[PDB]
Amino acid sequence: AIKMMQAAQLHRASIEIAFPMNVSLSPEIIVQCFIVWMSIPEQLLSDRSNFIIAAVIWAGFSADDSYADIMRRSARASDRQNYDIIKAALSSRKFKLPRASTTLFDENEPVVRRYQIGRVYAPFPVDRYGSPVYSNCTKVELASDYNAEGF
Amino acid sequence: TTLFDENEPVVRRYQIGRVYAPFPVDRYGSPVYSNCTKVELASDYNAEGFTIRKDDFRALQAVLRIDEDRAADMFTTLRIMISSIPAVWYDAEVVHYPHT
């Protein structure tokens, strides 16, 4: 909670995710990546972490490319660009994922102070009126099954 | 069978390469033959006796398939064995015959 609150203020202290060691595509990794994808706002994460999460998600849906073949896309493009490509692929006519996002928030209680005040990202994927905020599209629907290597 | 390029995230000092898989299973898990997945014969099989009918090869083929459940566990060993053997060793010659 403290780290997420800090990462929503400094504009440069985005969270960096440490993945498990020497275990690839374990069953728990997939579900944890899914939870991160559709529960943690995208603006609070680093580009590298977003790219890794997106790669793990897209590995099981691509017809041809595998997890290693996707991680090999590190060259020939940047991290943010690869993340954008994958996310656009996940909001097409064949696949649709929420990808919880967030927005700025600048409502405050007037009170006498001495210093300046600022705007902070909401570490909460919810909006002011209770409706969820999603980056691309809602009502998750997809015309295939998650086919990882063996999971 | 078909080659595989998958690997593991681990700190290693050498390059890795693709290997064949020790089973006919594809990434999807279906059997993978070379010509076609149908077994029909014009006549029977005879050779100094020992006659086989055309309706037994079909059953034998139908019983040799993989359980299709063990696909996940079967690939983990391949994954952890591909990414731990230096790729420059794949051209070595044999020195002890009984090992093959």
Added chain:
Amino acid sequence: TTLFDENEPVVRRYQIGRVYAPFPVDRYGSPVYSNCTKVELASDYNAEGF
């Protein structure tokens, strides 16, 4: 299956409609098929054995 409009006499305030039946019967013991009530095939059934 087909649609049945049979209505029971009871006091109610709202209109009712037609529903499908959860069985292929048409109020007679004979069942209902879309195409024809015959089973003739050219050859046997074979798919990776079986």
Added chain:
Amino acid sequence: AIKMMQAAQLHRASIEIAFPMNVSLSPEIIVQCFIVWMSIPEQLLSDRSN
């Protein structure tokens, strides 16, 4: 039976079959599919199941 009756009433809540196969087939799957084809009316199943 309850699910089938519900599918009969509402034409949007068609029954969606969940199968235990991924790529391969099995002797029980074929006979169960034939039983479904010859017994369960098509108006109570979704397009994917058909």
